Amino acid sequence: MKVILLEPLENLGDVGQVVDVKPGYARNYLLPRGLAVLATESNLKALEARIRAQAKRLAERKAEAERLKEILEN
RNA sequence: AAGGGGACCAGCCUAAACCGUCCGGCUUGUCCGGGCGGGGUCGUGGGGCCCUCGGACCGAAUCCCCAGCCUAGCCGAAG
Ligand SMILES: [Mg+2]
Ligand SMILES: [Mg+2]
Ligand SMILES: [Mg+2]
Numbered sequence: 415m416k417v418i419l420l421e422p423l424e425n426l427g428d429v430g431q432v433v434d435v436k437p438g439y440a441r442n443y444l445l446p447r448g449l450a451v452l453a454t455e456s457n458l459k460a461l462e463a464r465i466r467a468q469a470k471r472l473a474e475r476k477a478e479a480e481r482l483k484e485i486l487e488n
Numbered sequence: 489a490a491g492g493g494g495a496c497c498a499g500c501c502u503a504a505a506c507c508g509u510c511c512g513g514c515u516u517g518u519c520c521g522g523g524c525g526g527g528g529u530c531g532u533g534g535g536g537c538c539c540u541c542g543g544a545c546c547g548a549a550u551c552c553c554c555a556g557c558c559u560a561g562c563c564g565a566a567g
């Protein structure tokens with residue numbers, strides 16, 4: 415069963431990553447302890463749109479700060 | 489059972505794509521979810537979206553009215 419990790423877990427996976435686990439592990443351990451969520455089609459959109467938004471708010475630093483390396487250095 | 493002969497006869501509404509709005513979750517937006525409205529309903533496949541040209545008839549199974557009918561009756565030939 416596929417889940418989306420909310421936290422990095424040793425010898426499991428990294429935060430925001432999709433991993434395969436047995437249904438019982440997800441249902442009786444990971445999910446109740448807030449450590450993951452089901453890789454449902456709803457959640458995969460929400461994860462996507464966060465990975466997307468972080469890359470957006472990153473590039474617009476490396477560009478409006480890059481605009482500063484234009485004024486300075488000249 | 490098909491098929492044939494007859495009785496009767498009638499076909500519709502949604503879900504999803506997409507659009508709009510309200511509400512709330514936190515994991516902050518191009519988010520996810522819930523409600524309502526729009527859109528849509530099909531097998532010659534149909535629908536959505538985007539271009540392109542083109543602009544009255546239908547009509548309920550709902551509602552209103554009225555014939556008709558039912559729940560009492562009446563007239564009715566000639567020793
Ligand atoms: Mg027949
Ligand atoms: Mg008959
Ligand atoms: Mg018929």
Ligand SMILES: [Mg+2]
Pocket residue numbers: none
């Ligand atoms: Mg809100």
Ligand SMILES: [Mg+2]
Pocket residue numbers: 521
């Ligand atoms: Mg939804």
Ligand SMILES: [Mg+2]
Pocket residue numbers: none
């Ligand atoms: Mg929504």
Ligand SMILES: [Mg+2]
Pocket residue numbers: none
């Ligand atoms: Mg909605």
Ligand SMILES: [Mg+2]
Pocket residue numbers: none
């Ligand atoms: Mg088609």
Ligand SMILES: [Mg+2]
Pocket residue numbers: 500549
């Ligand atoms: Mg009808």
Ligand SMILES: [Mg+2]
Pocket residue numbers: 564
């Ligand atoms: Mg009499």
Ligand SMILES: [Mg+2]
Pocket residue numbers: none
């Ligand atoms: Mg008499």
